[model samples]
Target: MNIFEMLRIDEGLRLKIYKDTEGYYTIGIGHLLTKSPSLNAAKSELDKAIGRNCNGVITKDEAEKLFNQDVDAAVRGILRNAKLKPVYDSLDAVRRCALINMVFQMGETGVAGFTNSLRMLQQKRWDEAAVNGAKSRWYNQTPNRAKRVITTFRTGTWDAYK
Candidate 1:
């Protein structure tokens, strides 16, 4: 599967506002509305996107649009990091999706904190990178998702989804 399909599976679609695991107001395939400049602005944008006074509900089309936007931002965020850009560019598609998945869940800054893991990835030490990735609070936060991402890193294949 592609990055968007993988992320859709991991993030899931939510057509209405709901609290994420972190208790932040989120919607539309892991779109964290809490990060918006203000709740009013966020709601306004949401309403505008849905073309109605959708108090919370949104259409699948708009949600998909938001998901695409979020993924694009995550990609740009990863590529902007000086330490990560080269390593990211060096990875194959499966491994790149794994990196993007991590960055999508945890922000770019959060993923960047995995300095040793990043070094391992840069060297293409897949097993070491997977091990380092699993040894984290992120793993504890979402063990299943973490496993898939780590497996992708280890095998450089989409077998994790199976």
Candidate 2:
């Protein structure tokens, strides 16, 4: 099944998720958008909420009934392209996975915005690419998240994926 299917979206539409209170991700239904009120029955409640909330791209009235008809695959497919670009002439799985995860979290447009840098990566120009990669609206806007992934590019340790 697709990611939306895996996420159990069976629905009218999906919700716009930013960050939960703890700032991991606010997806599915049962997941709490914030910290645990108590942590006792949190998982159960969160799971239930997931069943009730997560639709797909649009949140309409028949959300739950049509949740299975979501299109998250499109989003994932886009990220897959960005992840499997012609750049990894020398990187490894961890590097690819890390970049894809970054793209997945940030959206293709956001990732693609690092154009000059992506080209640098394709040429195996490590330093310049890494620097450019960390200079986008993405990096400036989400330093915490961007920094977490850019480190992989900076280290050049991902050369194993090549």
Candidate 3:
């Protein structure tokens, strides 16, 4: 299945999902995913450190401050909040975690505005949710950032990272 379909990703709510939970990130900073060059191993270790989603507690700034040698806080944070299960289906583990990352970045107040998109998904209106998500004011606010996140949710590869 496609990424969006697998993760049950809706339109504009994408920002609420895409995330890099490797090290940690502040508002504008990101800790390196790993000390070594292995993005894959780094990805695994990062997940181990960040755990699931920190339940929106650890700030992105705190995430940025994570040093490879000092990821204990993040690890502890991840461990402390072990029950923060993903709100969506478990098909696309990467995308689901990414969504949690996005939710942490944007507060629930910001994410709550995506009513129709969530509705569409609940009713399985995939096409409408996808298009409308890309056309929202929320999407406009972040410029291409929104579109890229949605594209990744829709397609599979991380359009945002590209």
Candidate 4:
């Protein structure tokens, strides 16, 4: 309902550009495909396309409006999958959001590869799921985020994660 939450529910808190569905370009909440490449290569392509570099940044209000105009439609399709839905629905609110956040970051296919974690979720083994979620290469790269997710699932409270 709130702008921040909606932003999270859509494209997450990206203050920088990232590749979208087609690997074209995306930024802010849902502003897609404006022909931005990687940050290193962004200046040339972005300048060619829009006469600017990656230096261009949107206001928070602009980002929120972009989100409002078109939030992620992919998210619905992701959660609606039959095998995934039951497992996802088994969790409490915080845990559910954790799983959604997982899928959001890694997409459904990527999340599917988290075999033990997903199985633990389906089995409703909260502690094991938390541990398993944290026991990934991703955890090495993003320890704080991993801790937040693991703690959320383990405690079933939003307190630790947020």
Candidate 5:
């Protein structure tokens, strides 16, 4: 499956405002409405995206648009990272999707912290990479999503999409 399909399942569709697991004010398909440098800036973007004042509501079309934007940003973030770009390029479609999914949930910086995992991934040591990735607190915090991602890494398959 493509990144959009994978994210649709993992992030789920949320047209209403709510706090994410980390307590960030999020909306759409995991859009971090509170992600700007300041609350005011974030609120402004949220209002503009929803085409209204902050009313904690969004349409499916709006959410889909935001999801596309967010996914693009995540992909760019991953590729722009000097350390991750080459490793990401070395992966197949399924493994690349797993990496992008991790970046989507944790940001490039957070995923970069998986030094050993990235190393193993670059070396194509799939099982080792999966093990290293699973050792993170991210796994503990989001076991289901993490398991799917790690499984994708280990098997180089789209079982997670199923």
Candidate 6:
């Protein structure tokens, strides 16, 4: 398959901070960062990758390139997750988006702990998986988003009830 075609594959996306496998502070589209890649170094790198940028308020296009490398690395983990393997190919796009959002919220390791939910997904039990997910601490932590995600699986529409 062509490289461009591969980009069409899903690996989840996040434009915020999260920890990496090595426990480093990461942000953007999975950028695994630490103080070492100082702001200046990062700025220079960004300049090379996406052209010049002025101080503050970087455009989304430019910001995207900064996280490209990390997204590539992060997807490897998401794809390799056994618990999510079944859904990776069989689940609906919006439902997959919800699961990947889970990875963003709590790394693949955390997603792995969602045993009942993932198993239900494996068995193609959409409502059961949705119910299991709703019962999770994830639902408790982010009620609105959880409802939105659960609803995605409950129904096929990405927008769900909203």
TM-scores of all candidate predictions against the true structure? 0.89, 0.49, 0.43, 0.66, 0.91, 0.59
Q: Residue 130 of candidate 1: its Cα lDDT?
A: 84
Worst 10 residues of 4 by lDDT: 1-10
True-structure lDDT of candidate 5: 0.86
Q: What tens-digit string does per-residue lDDT give for candidate 4 at 1-162?
A: 332362364356455666765575666664553554556454344344344454645557655665554434335745677667777677667667766666655567767778778888778787888777777877886576667667777887766534
lDDT of 5 by residue, 28-146 (tens): 89898875445566667789877788667788998999888888999988879998999999988888988999899888999899998999999999888888888889999989989
Q: What's the best-to-worst order under lDDT?
A: 5, 1, 4, 6, 2, 3
Model 6, span 76-135: residue lDDT tens: 667887656766677766666666656655678888898888888877888988888888
Predicted candidate 4: what Cα RMSD to the true structure?
5.7
Q: List residue ranges in candidate 5 displaced over 4 A.
A: 35-45, 48-51
State the lDDT at 54 in candidate 1. 81
Q: For model 1, what is the error of residue 139's alpha carbon versus the real structure, in angstroms, after optimal superposition?
A: 0.3
Deviation in Å, model 6, residue 135 alpha carbon: 1.8
Q: Rank the candidates by TM-score, best first.
A: 5, 1, 4, 6, 2, 3
lDDT of 2 by residue, 3-89 (tens): 333234211123443344344434333222335454334434434545653322224433443333223433345436744456543
Q: Where does candidate 6 clash, by residue pair?
A: none
In model 2, the worst 10-residue window by lDDT is 5-14
What lDDT score is found at residue 153 in candidate 4? 74
What's model 4's overall lDDT?
0.62
Candidate 6 versus the native: TM-score?
0.59
Model 6 clash tally?
0
Q: Worst ten-residue run, lDDT, model 6?
A: 2-11
Off by over 4 Å in 3: 1-63, 66-87, 122-125
Q: Which stretches of candidate 1 lie over 4 Å from their true place?
A: 35-52
Q: What is the C-alpha lDDT of each candidate?
A: 0.86, 0.49, 0.44, 0.62, 0.86, 0.58
Q: Quote the lDDT for 106 in model 1.
A: 86
For candidate 3, what's the RMSD?
13.0
